[PDB]
Design a protein around this ligand. Sequence first.
Ligand SMILES: NC(=O)C1=CN([C@@H]2O[C@H](COP(=O)(O)OP(=O)(O)OC[C@H]3O[C@@H](n4cnc5c(N)ncnc54)[C@H](OP(=O)(O)O)[C@@H]3O)[C@@H](O)[C@H]2O)C=CC1
Ligand SMILES: NC(=O)C1=CN([C@@H]2O[C@H](COP(=O)(O)OP(=O)(O)OC[C@H]3O[C@@H](n4cnc5c(N)ncnc54)[C@H](OP(=O)(O)O)[C@@H]3O)[C@@H](O)[C@H]2O)C=CC1
Lengths: 966, 966
Amino acid sequence: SAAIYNIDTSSESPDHYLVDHTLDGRVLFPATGYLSIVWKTLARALGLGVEQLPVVFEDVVLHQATILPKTGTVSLEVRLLEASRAFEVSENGNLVVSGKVYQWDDPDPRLFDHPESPTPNPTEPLFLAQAEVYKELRLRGYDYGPHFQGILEASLEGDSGRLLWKDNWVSFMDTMLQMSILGSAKHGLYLPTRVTAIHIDPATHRQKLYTLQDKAQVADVVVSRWLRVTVAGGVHISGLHTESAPRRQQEQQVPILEKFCFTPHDSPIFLPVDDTSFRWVESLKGILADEDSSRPVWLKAINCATSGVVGLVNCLRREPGGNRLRCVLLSNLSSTSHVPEVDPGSAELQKVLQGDLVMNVYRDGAWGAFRHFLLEEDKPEEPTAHAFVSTLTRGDLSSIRWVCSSLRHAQPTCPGAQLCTVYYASLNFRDIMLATGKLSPDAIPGKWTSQDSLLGMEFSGRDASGKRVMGLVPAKGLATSVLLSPDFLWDVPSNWTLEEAASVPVVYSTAYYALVVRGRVRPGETLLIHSGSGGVGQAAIAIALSLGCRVFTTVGSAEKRAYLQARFPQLDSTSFANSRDTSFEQHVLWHTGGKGVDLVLNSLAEEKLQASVRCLATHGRFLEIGKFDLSQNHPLGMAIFLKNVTFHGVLLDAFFNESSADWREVWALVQAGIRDGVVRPLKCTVFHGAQVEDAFRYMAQGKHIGKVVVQVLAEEPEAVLKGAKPKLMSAISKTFCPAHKSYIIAGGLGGFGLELAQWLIQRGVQKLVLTSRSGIRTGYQAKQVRRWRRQGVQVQVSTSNISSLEGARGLIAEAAQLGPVGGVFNLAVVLRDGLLENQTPEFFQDVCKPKYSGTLNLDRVTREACPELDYFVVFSSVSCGRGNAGQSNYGFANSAMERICEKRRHEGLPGLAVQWGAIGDVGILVETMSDTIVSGTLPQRMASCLEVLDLFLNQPHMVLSSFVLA
Amino acid sequence: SAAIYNIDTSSESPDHYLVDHTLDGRVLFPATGYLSIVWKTLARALGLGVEQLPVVFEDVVLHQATILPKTGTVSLEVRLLEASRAFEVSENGNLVVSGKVYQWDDPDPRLFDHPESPTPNPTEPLFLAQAEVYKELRLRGYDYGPHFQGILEASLEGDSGRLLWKDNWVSFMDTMLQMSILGSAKHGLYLPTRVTAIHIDPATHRQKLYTLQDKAQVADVVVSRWLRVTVAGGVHISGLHTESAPRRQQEQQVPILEKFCFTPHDSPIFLPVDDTSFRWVESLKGILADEDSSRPVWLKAINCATSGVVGLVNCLRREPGGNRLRCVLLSNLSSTSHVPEVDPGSAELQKVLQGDLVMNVYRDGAWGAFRHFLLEEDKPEEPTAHAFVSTLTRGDLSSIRWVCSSLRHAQPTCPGAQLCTVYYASLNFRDIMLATGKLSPDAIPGKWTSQDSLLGMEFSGRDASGKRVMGLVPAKGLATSVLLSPDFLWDVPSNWTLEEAASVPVVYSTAYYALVVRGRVRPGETLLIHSGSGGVGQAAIAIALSLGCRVFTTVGSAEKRAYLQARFPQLDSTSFANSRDTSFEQHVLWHTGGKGVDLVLNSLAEEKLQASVRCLATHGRFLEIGKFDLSQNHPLGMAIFLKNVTFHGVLLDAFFNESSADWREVWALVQAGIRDGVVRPLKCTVFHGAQVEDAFRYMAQGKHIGKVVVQVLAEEPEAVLKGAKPKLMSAISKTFCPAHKSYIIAGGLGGFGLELAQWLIQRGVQKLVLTSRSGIRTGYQAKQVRRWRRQGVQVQVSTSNISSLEGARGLIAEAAQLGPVGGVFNLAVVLRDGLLENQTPEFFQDVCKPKYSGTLNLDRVTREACPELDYFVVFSSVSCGRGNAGQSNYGFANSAMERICEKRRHEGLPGLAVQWGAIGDVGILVETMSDTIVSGTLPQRMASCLEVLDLFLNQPHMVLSSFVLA
Ligand SMILES: NC(=O)C1=CN([C@@H]2O[C@H](COP(=O)(O)OP(=O)(O)OC[C@H]3O[C@@H](n4cnc5c(N)ncnc54)[C@H](OP(=O)(O)O)[C@@H]3O)[C@@H](O)[C@H]2O)C=CC1
Ligand SMILES: NC(=O)C1=CN([C@@H]2O[C@H](COP(=O)(O)OP(=O)(O)OC[C@H]3O[C@@H](n4cnc5c(N)ncnc54)[C@H](OP(=O)(O)O)[C@@H]3O)[C@@H](O)[C@H]2O)C=CC1
């Protein structure tokens, strides 16, 4: 009865294509693989083939992921309950997939009709090609191989496209899921966990498939987020639910990060490489012709201080004969104008020749070279008044640090939002779940970036005017300051303390919303509060006892029983039950006469929830404030509703999305309970802001009673202190940008350009000027730019070529039109590869014009008319630091950029040259070349690249490098 | 994997004991049989025995009953999903049982600890013996055989007892269920359909079993209705849910009903049988000694007119020599005193001897006999102003008739209750479900007797003062008059009609409760009403459009669409969707922007409910007014509550149990909607009261739009008609009794006595006087009497022996102390069996004293001091009409009783002699003897006996008989 499927991903195995279903570097069994396997089991059970068996899956739950090992075989057992229409996929006795499967008796082709789009697509010519679709997906973390790369075309919105049919149901339905998650605003690796219904009718699937000019069978796919339905061919997927799988910390991208600083130490053929027309390149070719007399080739850069022949020599030494030519450079790169220029016709040149160093650089009287050093692993910390608590690595409370917040680098001022100095910030159970990784950051409603830390949901402190307030925030409450609407603030009473007030907002708002607004608790109603020792439980007890309600509370220990007895003397011995067992059901049903309770404020889970449901009386109100059974879609028997029972799903976090008068009702309830003495501060276990990690691991164990409070600022003795400024603490430096400043990315439409632009928007950039010679051509560029514009960012796609000084001047002009120029990023690149033999001075000019001349002009115009500039970053290559075969012009342009940035930083101006190794997921190496070893180094992924760039932007080093070794 | 169990109930089969699990004459597979079978499957799967496998069943659902045929074998397949802990019992591919089964890993003996009783048991000596327990159960319809008769002792409350252990888990757990349903107030056959949890730990089961003096292993069982838990031995059953299985109409008890009326036409040994000392019995023995001269044995009854030697001769003729003796009787039973007595010493005796008739009776100048005639099958109909609609046979709309109601024979008058003449009574979907049998009468909340008809939930008419009102009732609304609280009445406005007003109460109260009280609908909220063409749907549309709410309504036809468009012009084309498919989900999610609706008033079922749940918006309120998914305990995925969603189980029928201000809120809402014009009468399809069956079958098909209304009384033109009396219609006569009258059952503590007493309480008897020589001795008697007393009936257990005239006088005195004597029932009997040879005059005296002398004295004292007497019933035997071997004194006493009743009826006084055949389930034949053929006749069951008695009490025949032939 148990159909066995030995999934082998060996080369000769029929299931070898499954190696291409790689998700975060792990070969996982697709959910559609389970669908096909259960389909095959049902077809054998009915004595048919899958192609002759139209099938319906219902309530498919994916309980765990099956990892397909590189060597071995995974055995999946499918058992069918035909009478109950159920199936079960298990692996080694562990339930993998459950749900209902049955033959579609009357298959309706009209089901597989594409739903109309809510809005017509204006950019019909602009779509996502297959390479673009899977570049975006691999950016999200889906490393789909060729067998699972079945999306040829997709619209920019991600609601329509085409899927190639390789006579494979697993791949086709997986590409269905890929197209479903392609038009997703949420970022990260989202995996299917539930599907409400899947109808596969292979008969109409054969009809829906059509052949293109490529002779490849394809099918139109449509995703409707309004109807929650994906249709393609003869497959219909309704109610697909995906949860964000936390990306594994065992990432092989541990980049080598390095620093580039000037470090003091036959017949010679001298070549002046200082000419701006690159006419010497052909001359260098002549020097490469000879063998004996070409041993002392001395290329000297005397005139220009930012010539950058270092990368030239580094790249030419790798060419055949480069070492034999012994290319030795003399770079007179004087950082300051007061330093005397070394005469190359004097004894200094003879001394340099006697030294025979591969590279000689003169810097302010020092004759040295350019060497690579290891970058310090200590994270840059700065003294700021605006910081937040964040877990650097998810799931690890040890990696809990204060990081500079977006309020430090961008101070906002607008009505309807108030900046309050946080003196005390309360931990909540959701904060513990976030910091321990048990809860995904995306599960919290709101617009949160990937780098955003959502720790902290409630605080107390002082507003801008100095008034002593306490506030409730959706997130970012565990900070030195909070930007929140004044609608979520209460005045702290005179008798209260800020320490005390920090425990009221979340807990009492939740209790008031649940009991009064939702539960509509009336005086004298019997009521069961679960975990009455906790914050929300204690508040619910206070509210109920203010109304003279009989309270049955469940506590997990006798000490919590004693605390609740002392705190609420209205509770008697029969008020208390166990929360760690189901016996609270028996206690309640006995002490209530078998009737039940009028309300159940429930945070318990699984069977403990079901027992809580069995504690309900007639007309009982079950207020579910827990999330586990809700998030797991656990079944609730509906017979309880025969008791006139109301079931509330109570989520206070819904009040931060609309903030209408519905929240003001709960606010007024809390304020009234404050003035009536009903709302009373809970017990607060206080950890100082210097040790927030200990607060987290303390509250994680659960021995706490009441509220854990992190004191960010000690409450000074005063009612309304006019200052109200946060004290300066050392927090990890993080790159953030003012919303009033404009930021330019020259070459911002490229792979790294678009990724950097998105990263900058995530860092507060609101005015972007991306420059490209050709403008927006690809559908990926259009989708990214239109998404940023819809998000509210002024993204200008400029054509102003920075190669010309007039072009850079006009570019700075269009940037300043939006706002003062805060940053410029030189990512413009053109490539004219090839060895020195087949190299042209025109090729050198073409390659250096975006980099050499581009950075010349950017530096000049920023010096002239950019007083508020904070960032001057250029993207150089590792081919500059070490050298690449047949990339001499690339290295020369990159070294010129580095010299420019060093010269800028020497005068105190912002300057940064990032030597990037092989860049992954996007760029020129991804398009031209193919996780392939390039020059001994792996392509660094974007996530790692942006992390390293964030680190580099907070360093004092002119030039740093990042590359992942193989 | 599928363990096969071939259940064979043959004599040599190991599962032969299953023949003893008979429920309503059908051998059914016990639910505990499925438990044991799944247990065996799990033990084989784990390679263990059941006795070594502690097991846990969870969420056990019994989807269908398995009938075990007398000849054959039923194959039950058990499949296990060990990974998901599920099991499935199927029969021929049909799901029989589902649920979770798994090994109890850490078995807790403390679980099998008997919960304390809510109240101590005062009557410790008074318990239910095994015979009593199973007599009560077989009265409820559980014909358990000896193998499943494992309850030795049970307390009167039914919450404790002992269960015999026959090394059989099926039988033990079935007796657990029997004891669970023994203390049930609900009557009828209740079968398990769901069990929440079952823990079986055989290890502690062996310890809990103990041996009595009988050397039989037994275990204490405790049922806790407060905790919903039954514990016995090492078995724990929590959350057992039972539904009333409708008793099969294919009942073999089709009694022969008959009438007993006086029908005009060697050496003789004359025996005067008129002596009141029975001294002639021995003389008759002498007449039985001879053979030749004993041929003309002439036993003459001359003095007493109520001698009743007819039964004597009928019983003596069956004795050996009775026919040879040719027992010929001469009964001078003159009905009136003016009739001349026939002289037995004249030519009349010679003529009678020449006729040689077996029996000769002189009645007012007619020389005839007593012959049995067939009773007319036409039900007695009487003209009454108080009738109700009822289905005589459940599930059959053809058997829909008007029956006389309890308001005819008992007119109540008390504050807080009003008697309103019903002019129009509305049918509702629940009424159709009741009359078609799809809905059990017990599913309706309230105190409803077995014979109560619950048809009709709403009416309009006139109150006692004549005011034109409309009312909402829990049941009995389909009547000519309704007794209801004035709290459930509205005044009908002047512009309204009673016809119109009859459609408002149920429909608009439901809509107001759901939308306003429960859903808290706010103006402008999007809202999905299912079946908007129906009554409740139309009312919800009216309420929502009164608030300016956007309405999505689902209708099943285009004609219903057109009707709703014409009726509510605020609905546009996009307001309407299909209710017969799930596509309303797609329509709603499209036309709402994917957000959903704020409310869903749902009456749809199964997947159509789930789609309705998928139509909910954030903070959406799902008001479930349907019952199918609720009653079936269908699963509801809790992920919907992640959307801040509220789920209301809306049941308006809960307002008839408490009737607090919570109902007055809905009442005020309806009244306000009436004065504001929001509440508008629906379309009414009217069937006159003469044809109610056609209204039922019309509304059953579902082509109706609005409300089906039965016009009981045509609305006369007047505002407040002072008369307000219902018109007299012919309704089936039903026995009902005034609450102010006292009723005596002589011998009312016997089997038939207790059953008749319960039947009389169900017919309105509130003052009962049961007489017994020995008083209350058995626990069954105590339980019945205390249940009646707790129900509110004044039950007096008198010892006044009716054999003496003083005793009967005192009995009538204690009866009149409670209230005027409305009825007397002679069920007193003592038996002195044995043939005429071994018969004694003292035996005749003893047997006749409760019957002969008892009815003498009852008749005399009722003639003297019982002017308001309505019933004078005596229970005679079929042994009187035909004759039984060795029961001559019994037949003589029964015939004397019959003569007394005939004499009473001749003077116009109430009189009835019911010749009962073998009586089943209770009585002397059940105790002394054993579905066994007795004298060629089967024992008539109580249900049939009480039905036949109800029929007999409404007849004009002095003596009728009822017996079931074999
Ligand atoms: N890919 C890699 O492995 C490495 C990348 N880098 C750095 O990363 C940056 C981006 O490279 P990559 O990661 O490959 O992503 P891309 O190569 O896709 O982005 C390059 C951008 O440069 C633009 N550009 C080129 N010339 C000009 C010009 N004259 N004016 C305006 N824009 C111009 C291009 O637009 P258009 O041509 O239409 O004008 C393009 O948008 C480069 O600065 C590069 O040095 C460094 C080392 C390695
Ligand atoms: N069982 C059958 O098959 C048949 C029954 N019937 C009728 O059904 C009626 C009851 O018989 P049954 O069905 O067996 O149920 P029961 O025999 O159990 O009820 C008989 C009752 O008569 C009582 N009784 C007897 N003598 C007296 C007395 N002197 N004063 C007061 N009460 C007395 C008994 O109480 P106690 O002795 O303590 O006083 C007992 O409660 C009888 O009238 C009988 O004729 C008729 C035909 C067949």
